[PDB]
Amino acid sequence: CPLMVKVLDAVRGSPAINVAVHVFRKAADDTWEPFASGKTSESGELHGLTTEEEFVEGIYKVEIDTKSYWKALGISPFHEHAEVVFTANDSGPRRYTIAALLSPYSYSTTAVVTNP
Amino acid sequence: CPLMVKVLDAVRGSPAINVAVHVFRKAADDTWEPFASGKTSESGELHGLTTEEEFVEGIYKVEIDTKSYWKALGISPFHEHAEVVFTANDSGPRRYTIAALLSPYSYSTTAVVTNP
Amino acid sequence: CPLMVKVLDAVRGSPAINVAVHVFRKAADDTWEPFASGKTSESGELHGLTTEEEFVEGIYKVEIDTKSYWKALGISPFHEHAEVVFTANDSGPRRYTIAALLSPYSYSTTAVVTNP
Amino acid sequence: CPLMVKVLDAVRGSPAINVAVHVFRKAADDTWEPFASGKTSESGELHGLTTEEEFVEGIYKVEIDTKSYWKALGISPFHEHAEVVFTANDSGPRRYTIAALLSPYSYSTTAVVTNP
Ligand SMILES: Cc1ccc(C)c(OCCCC(C)(C)C(=O)O)c1
Ligand SMILES: Cc1ccc(C)c(OCCCC(C)(C)C(=O)O)c1
Ligand code: NA
Ligand code: NA
Numbered sequence: 491c492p493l494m495v496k497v498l499d500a501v502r503g504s505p506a507i508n509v510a511v512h513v514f515r516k517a518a519d520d521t522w523e524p525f526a527s528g529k530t531s532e533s534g535e536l537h538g539l540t541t542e543e544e545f546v547e548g549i550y551k552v553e554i555d556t557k558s559y560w561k562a563l564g565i566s567p568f569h570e571h572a573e574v575v576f577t578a579n580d581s582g583p584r585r586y587t588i589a590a591l592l593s594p595y596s597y598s599t600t601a602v603v604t605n606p
Numbered sequence: 607c608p609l610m611v612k613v614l615d616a617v618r619g620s621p622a623i624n625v626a627v628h629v630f631r632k633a634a635d636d637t638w639e640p641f642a643s644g645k646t647s648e649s650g651e652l653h654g655l656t657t658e659e660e661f662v663e664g665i666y667k668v669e670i671d672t673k674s675y676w677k678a679l680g681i682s683p684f685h686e687h688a689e690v691v692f693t694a695n696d697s698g699p700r701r702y703t704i705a706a707l708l709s710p711y712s713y714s715t716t717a718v719v720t721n722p
Numbered sequence: 723c724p725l726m727v728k729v730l731d732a733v734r735g736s737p738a739i740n741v742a743v744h745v746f747r748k749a750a751d752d753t754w755e756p757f758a759s760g761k762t763s764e765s766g767e768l769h770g771l772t773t774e775e776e777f778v779e780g781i782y783k784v785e786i787d788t789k790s791y792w793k794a795l796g797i798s799p800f801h802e803h804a805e806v807v808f809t810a811n812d813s814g815p816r817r818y819t820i821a822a823l824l825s826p827y828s829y830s831t832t833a834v835v836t837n838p
Numbered sequence: 839c840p841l842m843v844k845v846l847d848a849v850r851g852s853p854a855i856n857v858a859v860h861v862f863r864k865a866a867d868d869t870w871e872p873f874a875s876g877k878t879s880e881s882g883e884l885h886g887l888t889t890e891e892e893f894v895e896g897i898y899k900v901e902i903d904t905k906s907y908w909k910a911l912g913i914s915p916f917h918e919h920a921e922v923v924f925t926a927n928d929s930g931p932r933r934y935t936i937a938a939l940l941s942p943y944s945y946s947t948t949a950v951v952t953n954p
Binding site: 615 | 847848849850851916939941942943944946
């Protein structure tokens with residue numbers, strides 16, 4: 491699994507379950523092309539977005555749909571979503587974990603990048 | 607001031623100085639139109655972005671050019687830039703402070719929304 | 723002002739108002755001795771804690787009574803309190819800002835250390 | 839595993855490896871008694887601190903030795919350590935994950951609490 495996303499909830503002290511995630515890759519014409527999407531499991535984790543073959547060099551945007559997550563829980567949050575934009579695989583294939591920690595008026599993100 | 611941006615550096619323990627910040631407003635056709643921009647001051651702050659009359663309800667995106675910031679300090683960064691995407695809502699308090707805390711592989715953002 | 727504390731609320735998107743803050747200095751016998759304390763203002767800030775003459779090099783601990791803060795808002799919190807433990811060093815810049823961002827199961831803190 | 843600790847590094851985009859962790863439990867006399875300690879693995883994780891039997895009701899302090907971690911990498915950090923202080927197992931046994939994200943002048947912590 492070359493790209494994985496994990497999301498925690500800072501209000502409940504739990505995984506953030508059923509969070510929609512959309513990944514885009516910047517195209518030659520500088521627009522964002524849809525690349526992969528899915529939703530986090532009971533453990534807050536989203537596996538299986540892509541494959542080593544398809545996950546080529548590029549600029550990627552991981553959009554985490556925080557608003558829909560909070561509204562589904564009955565909360566009115568500040569942000570529309572949380573974005574993480576980065577160049578990937580520029581020095582050969584790596585494995586990326588994108589982690590986010592959510593609050594209604596705040597979020598944090600970090601990346602773990604490892605070499606297989 | 608209806609909209610203020612403040613950026614801090616978690617590696618140096620300082621304001622993030624001379625960081626470029628672009629604000630966009632979402633247009634009816636869902637494209638992002640330029641709205642305001644500037645560079646953070648010696649205190650990491652960017653004031654004067656807009657006025658009450660110009661800052662109407664809507665979806666806004668604040669793009670912080672973190673990559674240039676780190677490169678100017680000789681640090682290899684992960685992100686292309688940081689985004690903060692939010693709805694401005696007249697019901698709520700009048701003044702928005704968007705704060706961001708920068709690290710090379712991570713970032714945190716929060717909103718401080720208050721009445722004078 | 724050589725030492726300032728600022729506290730924000732990630733659930734409400736506001737300053738954290740009326741939060742008790744205790745500062746301790748580490749004594750030669752490794753116990754923590756009271757040094758200064760106060761309550762955050764309506765802007766989430768606590769000024770006037772100490773003076774240049776009193777704030778000598780050493781190890782300090784800033785305790786923020788997060789549990790009382792959340793309970794006063796009717797929110798069930800995880801932590802007993804938040805701590806920030808650091809060395810004051812005269813080599814470095816003169817002014818220390820300790821900032822904390824509070825959620826019920828999480829918190830973030832950073833230091834902004836600058837010269838006037 | 840009723841108590842686990844995970845630590846990431848925001849500068850390197852990696853697990854924080856070989857981080858010393860000390861856990862204390864508040865005693866009847868209000869002093870902090872040593873409870874368990876260990877260090878994070880190659881994956882940034884610390885398992886095996888305690889057992890369901892020994893991990894009784896109490897106020898616990900998880901001290902993460904961030905200074906020793908950064909100094910071992912040649913960096914002079916701001917904080918002495920990162921503390922997480924909380925009441926545990928007050929409503930029966932739970933499983934706690936304590937996560938931290940480290941930068942030289944900043945850290946973040948969150949907790950995941952689950953019911954077995
Ligand atoms: C303290 C903090 C700040 C910011 C973020 C994004 C955090 O993310 C959760 C990391 C979870 C992890 C370690 C990847 C895991 O579950 O194995 C944590
Ligand atoms: C601990 C932490 C984590 C993440 C962020 C974004 C933080 O914001 C900095 C707040 C600075 C403030 C209060 C807006 C000011 O200087 O006026 C703080
Ligand atoms: Na290349
Ligand atoms: Na009980």
